[PDB]
Write a protein that binds this DNA or RNA. Structure first.
Lengths: 50, 99, 420, 94, 129, 314, 99, 76
RNA sequence: CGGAGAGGUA
DNA sequence: GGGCTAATGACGGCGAATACCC
DNA sequence: GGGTATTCGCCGTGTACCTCTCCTAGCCC
């Protein structure tokens, strides 16, 4: 469903523990939004996959 | 913010316009237009009623519905809830839950 | 020769390349992919590549009956057995030497490593950008160095009787013609006796290793620069045009046509003693066309829609998926085979399998025909066809005879072990 | 005793295997394809004969492909007081 | 052709390690030519230009000089190996094959320049008729 | 903990030196316990400075799980990564050579450990990641194969140190145990031939007729050394150590270029074959499939053998 | 579905398509491998060379069978000759040296 | 009729060159050049060659001397 | 008919 | 007409290309 | 110091078939 998507980032760890977090805004139509973490607790934004 | 190399609107818009659209020497007017297109177009950026409802529930808003487009309040709320999850007191959405 | 192992791959010498082929294509003509008539002369020639259609005359306009397996020239055709068709291949004798792109774009640039300068110099000279001193001026000038146009001139007015510097593949041809590999090997190995430096010894050992490799290969470096270009028979390359608005990739054909066009233009220019700039440019796009012919993946690969396959080139025609097309996938479906659901027969002995009568009848039609014409029950293949299709009781004895002990091979759809 | 039980590099089929069972032995050194010094091939006696046959293997028969299909055949069947506390010997022996 | 040709034969300026070349990867070749050129003056240059007609014939004569000096250099280097062995030398089995002991090893460049000077004297004598 | 820490606490590794009842240092050769127990991570120190104890008393306590260690995953992926010889949760280093051992520059990157042979090259240190469970002291005498970092050992170091047959047994036992877990029984000669395929490549240590280090067919090493003792003039040589390439890596390492032509990048491989003039024996079977001729196996091998027997016999 | 002759395709000469007489069976690389593990050599040669691709060989071999004798001669493999000419056009000579 | 190859395995221990030699024997009585040396049971030439080699009648030495024979007659 | 995309079966 | 014509709701590897603690 | 530890684009695809579509494209005469 369109809306917020709170998931666990387990492939971004890149051979490390502490699985990260991600929040994806999925519109009914338009551009996706992504707020992901890093293994250093830094919050990054990806508009679509860029 | 320490990682963020911007502190003002025009530089951020320049960077975002360049990274959405590689090359293409940036124009602040073009960057503003692209940002408005990406998050404030009423004709090609829709959340629909279902998206708004799920969105508010994910943010656990007292609201039931609202705009079909994204707002600053929406982004700040989603960042707040993501930070809450990072703090270990939020919830992670089940990928397959039929809700 | 007999079916042997231990096969030898080496760089071909121009003389024996000429020995392979028989004659040279005069003018290139290729199908338009909306007109499928093989136009001659060109990529479709029944004198150099063998008869495209056997036992008949083919020139693209001529279909006369006369040369149905006899050697004689009527419009320029040669008709022989299909064995000669397989061995008949073409060559074109280039006026100018041309390099092979694979040894240039490869990370171990064979010309670059052999000549001991970075591949940038070789790509510059081959792409007709910067001159190279081909054993030219040495008293003040340098024996093997790249030159820009103004530097090349400056050297020329400095010296023109002790100085030579060419462009393109002829420069590398002159360079590689100069070295005596044995002298280099002897000097390097005997220097290694005197040298006491670790890095210097490593460098000498590497150079002598490369030189000894070329010596043992029996390949003269002048060979690896293409002097005469051999060309396939038309039927030996992928070509399957589709009717309508949809077609199939056939870049190899028009790459051949383009290369022949460039070479013919260069031949015409040289026959007329055209000036240096024009002939050099002609050699330039001739080399470019030859390199695109050799590969387009060395020229930059890209993905085309509706087919997860790059644009056809001779190098990409070397290998498709999963490899050599006719020895693995895809897809090697084979005749004289059948497929059917299985039932249990608990009366068959361990060396027996119960096979349906129709399946046997259609698996052994040639053997049945042979037996039927052997007993005199049929006088021709048509009579045998009628005899088997009429399902007469006689064919049952024939099939029992051809199946008396003729075994069959059953394989499971996935074969995960030998017994499969 | 140091008496010779089996001759030089003899094939250890069922009879010799039983003879080694009765004369219980901890270990045997055996010819291996790993120990094999054959080049562009493998010694038969360095290999053994365990196949759909019961006689010493011969020249040919690319045992590499046989090995690969033998390792891949059961691949489908592959599915996804004591140590560190106290060693308790469960039998009477030296 | 000249009965006297001034040349750089057996100078003290031809004794130096050949470190001048025409491209990257500094190593043998495109230094041999520099070696036997340094042992000859420009006089020999115009003498060989006038003696030999056509550019490529002069070039082939240049590589004739180069192969001759290479033969003499090889000659000198295995004479050096031979005299080291006779004077007492034990082959050192190094990461790159066989060499001689450092106290007995000379230099490939020195044998090269000595051979170049010898052949330069020979070619000057050839000019002298 | 053993893991990386500050730059002022990772230059000195904690140690509990145990002296005799005379106040003098003592060392016991031939034992991986000289006296100074160099303390690994989470090593609770029980004895203070100057505390008198008996022989048989605990020095340090390191909590353990009483079982439950995860060094094996099992299943077909386990089979595959053993066949690819992948590092199991980073390799557990062994005694890289026999001799006395000591510490170098601790935690410069990771830790360094010098192993000093009494007849070899004394500077022989290796790298020690702090993620490994350390069991290593100074002044202790070790030998090749002795565990230095505790944990799952990779086949690569096992081959490099304990010998060919050791890693042969290791791989055979691992794969056979995995297949026994499903109850399937496979004769180990198949695993032996697959391993003999795996380590068909070797790296020369002491240069011979080839370069100082390079991947070479070990059978070529045998023939070359046999030739070397055939004549008096040694070339060089030659000393080598087998190395385990991965299954895919060993496949692409095939001497015959026909294999690579169909299954790897081609133009570079074909050019290497052309310039080197590689006279491939065409020993390969699927390669004889690719060319279109009879395979050298079974009846086809017998046929080609008959042809060879008829060669120079007609 | 079973056949001995019938439909023939282009580019890759092998029975394909149609339902009036459906094509042969995909003699996949697994089957080649199963033949390989056995001493089975020749059957690989027929299932790859003489009854799969080479049209002249298939025709002559069908003629031989109809003549009343199960006949095949190795000679010069046609796919080998094709690949040989193909490599030769690359200015690369393939020597036929016998071991 | 005999379709099992044990006797041929015992006679020729390789049992693989066995296939080649029996195949040649079958090849040249299937087409003229030699005639069956065992009574035919409507059998294919494969199994009559197999029964020949089972009896010890056909072995490598015998077959090779026989073949070299048919040559020195066919040149003569 | 050459190769990709899709449903179904085993 | 037509004859020429030179990415997120896959998954994993992998070399190149960066990222970072002591 | 230097090895992880990320980022930065490409690419491969059990077995066999049943059906379907979709395939170098630009373009000046």
């Amino acid at each position: 469903s369109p809306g917020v998507f709170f998931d666990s980032d387990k492939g971004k760890t890149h051979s490390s523990g502490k699985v990260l977090y991600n929040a994806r805004i999925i519109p009914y139509r338009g551009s996706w939004l992504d707020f992901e973490f890093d293994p250093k607790d830094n919050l990054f934004v990806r508009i679509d996959r860029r | 913010l320490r990682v963020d190399p911007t502190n003002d609107r025009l530089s951020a818009l320049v960077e975002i316009y360049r990274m959405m659209r590689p090359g293409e020497p940036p124009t602040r007017e073009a960057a503003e237009s692209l940002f408005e297109n990406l998050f404030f177009s009423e004709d090609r950026y829709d959340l629909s009623a279902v998206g708004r409802m799920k969105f508010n529930r994910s943010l656990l808003r007292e609201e039931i519905e609202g705009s079909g487009i994204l707002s600053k309040d929406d982004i700040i709320d989603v960042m707040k809830k993501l930070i809450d999850i990072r703090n270990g007191k939020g919830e992670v959405d089940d990928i397959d839950h039929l809700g | 020769t007999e079916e042997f192992d231990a096969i030898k791959i080496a760089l071909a010498s121009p003389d024996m390349i000429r020995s392979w082929s028989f004659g040279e294509v005069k003018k290139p003509e290729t199908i338009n992919y909306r007109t499928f008539k093989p136009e001659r002369d060109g990529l479709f020639c029944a004198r150099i590549f063998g008869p495209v259609k056997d036992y008949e005359c083919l020139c693209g306009k001529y279909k006369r009956l006369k040369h149905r397996g006899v050697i004689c020239e009527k419009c320029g055709v040669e008709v022989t057995q299909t064995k000669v068709r397989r061995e008949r291949m073409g060559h074109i004798e280039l006026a100018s030497p041309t390099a092979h792109i694979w040894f240039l774009k490869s990370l171990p640039s064979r010309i670059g490593l052999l000549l001991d300068m970075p591949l940038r110099d070789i790509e510059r000279v081959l792409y007709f950008e910067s001159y190279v001193v081909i054993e030219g001026g040495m008293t003040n000038l340098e024996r093997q160095q790249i030159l820009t146009e103004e530097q090349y001139l400056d050297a020329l007015e400095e010296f023109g009787d002790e100085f030579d510097a060419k462009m393109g593949a002829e420069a590398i041809q002159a360079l590689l013609k100069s070295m005596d590999l044995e002298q280099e090997c002897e000097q390097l190995r005997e220097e290694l006796n005197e040298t006491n430096s670790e890095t210097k010894r490593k460098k000498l050992t590497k150079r002598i290793k490369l030189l000894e490799a070329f010596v043992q290969s029996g390949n003269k470096p002048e060979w690896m620069i293409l002097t005469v270009l051999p060309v396939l028979p038309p039927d030996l390359r992928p070509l399957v045009p589709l009717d309508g608005g949809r077609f199939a990739t056939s870049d190899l054909n028009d790459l051949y046509r383009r290369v022949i066009n460039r070479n013919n233009r260069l031949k015409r220019l040289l026959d007329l003693a055209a000036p240096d700039i024009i002939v050099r440019n002609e050699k330039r796009m001739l080399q470019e066309a030859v390199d695109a012919l050799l590969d387009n993946g060395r020229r930059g690969r890209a993905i085309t829609g509706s087919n997860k396959r790059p644009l056809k080139s001779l190098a990409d025609m070397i290998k498709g998926k999963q490899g050599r097309f006719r020895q693995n996938l895809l897809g090697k479906r084979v005749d004289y085979s059948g497929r059917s659901v299985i039932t249990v027969g608990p009366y068959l002995r361990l060396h027996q399998c119960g096979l349906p009568k129709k399946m046997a009848l259609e698996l052994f039609k040639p053997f049945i025909y042979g037996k039927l014409e052997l007993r005199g029950l049929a006088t021709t293949i048509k009579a045998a066809k009628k005899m088997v299709e009429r399902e007469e009781a006689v064919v049952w004895d024939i099939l029992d005879e051809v199946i008396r002990e003729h075994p069959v091979l059953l394989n499971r759809a996935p074969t995960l072990h030998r017994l499969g | 005793t140091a008496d010779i039980l089996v001759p030089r590099n003899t094939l250890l089929h069922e009879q010799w295997c039983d003879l080694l069972e009765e004369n219980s032995v901890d270990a045997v050194k055996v010819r291996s394809v790993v120990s094999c010094d054959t080049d562009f091939g493998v010694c038969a006696h360095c290999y053994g004969r365990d196949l759909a046959r019961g006689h010493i293997i011969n020249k040919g028969e690319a045992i590499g492909v046989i090995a690969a299909q033998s390792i891949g055949e059961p691949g489908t069947q592959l599915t996804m007081a004591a140590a560190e506390s106290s060693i308790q010997v469960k039998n009477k022996g030296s | 052709m000249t009965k006297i040709t001034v040349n750089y034969t057996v100078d003290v300026k031809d004794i130096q390690p050949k470190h001048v070349r025409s491209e990257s990867n500094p190593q043998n070749q495109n230094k041999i030519r520099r070696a036997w050129v340094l042992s000859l003056s420009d006089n020999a240059m115009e003498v060989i230009q006038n003696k030999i007609k056509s550019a490529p014939a002069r070039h082939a004569y240049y590589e004739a000089i180069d192969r001759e000096v290479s033969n003499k250099w090889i000659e000198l280097m295995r004479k050096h190996t031979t005299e080291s062995l006779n004077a007492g030398a034990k082959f050192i089995m190094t990461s790159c094959g066989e060499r001689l002991e450092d106290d007995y090893c000379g230099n490939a460049d020195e044998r090269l320049i000595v051979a170049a000077q010898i052949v330069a004297e020979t070619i000057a004598a050839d000019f002298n008729r | 903990d053993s893991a990386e820490r500050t730059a002022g606490g990772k230059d000195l590794r904690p140690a509990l030196k145990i002296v005799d009842a005379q106040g003098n240092d003592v060392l016991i050769p031939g034992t991986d316990m000289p006296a100074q127990y160099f303390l690994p991570g989470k090593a609770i120190v029980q004895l203070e400075d100057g505390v008198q104890i008996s022989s048989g008393d605990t020095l340090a306590r390191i909590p353990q799980e009483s079982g439950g260690t995860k060094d094996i995953t099992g299943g077909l992926p386990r089979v595959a990564d053993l066949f690819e010889a992948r590092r199991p949760k980073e390799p557990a280093i062994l005694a890289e050579i026999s001799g006395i051992v000591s510490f170098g520059k601790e935690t410069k990157g990771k830790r360094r450990l010098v192993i000093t042979p009494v007849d070899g090259s004394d500077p022989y240190e290796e790298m020690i990641p702090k993620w490994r469970q350390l069991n290593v002291f100074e002044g202790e005498r070790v030998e090749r194969g002795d565990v230095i970092s505790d944990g799952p050992e990779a086949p690569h170091d096992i081959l490099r140190l304990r010998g060919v047959h050791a890693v042969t047994r290791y791989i055979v036992n691992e794969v056979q145990d995995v297949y026994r877990l499903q109850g399937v029984k496979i004769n180990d000669k198949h695993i032996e031939v697959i391993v003999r395929q795996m380590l068909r490549k070797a790296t020369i240590v002491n240069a011979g007729s080839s370069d100082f280090l390079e991947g070479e067919q070990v059978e070529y090493s045998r023939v070359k050394i046999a030739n070397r003792e055939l004549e008096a003039n040694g070339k060089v040589g030659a000393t080598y150590s087998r190395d385990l390439l991965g299954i895919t890596k060993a496949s692409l390492a095939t001497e015959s270029f026909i294999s690579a032509a169909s299954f790897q990048e081609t133009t570079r491989v074909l050019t290497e074959a052309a310039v080197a003039g590689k006279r491939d024996e065409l020993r390969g079977l699927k390669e004889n499939v690719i060319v279109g001729r009879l395979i050298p196996a079974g009846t086809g091998y017998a046929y080609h053998q008959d042809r060879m027997r008829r060669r120079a016999a007609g | 579905h079973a056949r001995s002759t019938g439909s023939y395709s282009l580019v890759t000469q092998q029975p394909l398509g149609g339902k009036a007489q459906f094509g042969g069976q995909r003699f996949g690389e697994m089957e080649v491998w199963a033949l390989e593990a056995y001493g089975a050599a020749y059957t690989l040669q027929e299932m790859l060379t003489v009854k799969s691709d080479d049209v002249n060989g298939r025709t002559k071999m069908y003629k031989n069978i109809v003549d009343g004798n199960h006949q095949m001669e190795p000679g010069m493999p046609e796919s080998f000759n094709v690949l040989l000419k193909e490599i030769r056009s690359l200015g690369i000579n393939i020597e036929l040296e016998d071991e | 009729a005999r379709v099992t190859v044990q006797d041929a395995v015992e006679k020729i221990g390789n049992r693989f060159d066995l296939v080649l030699v029996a195949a040649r024997r079958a090849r040249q009585m299937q087409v003229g050049g030699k005639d069956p040396l065992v009574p035919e049971e409507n059998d294919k030439t494969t199994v009559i060659a197999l029964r020949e080699i089972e009896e010890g009648l056909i072995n490598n030495q015998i077959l090779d001397v026989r073949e070299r024979q048919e040559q020195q007659e066919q040149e003569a």
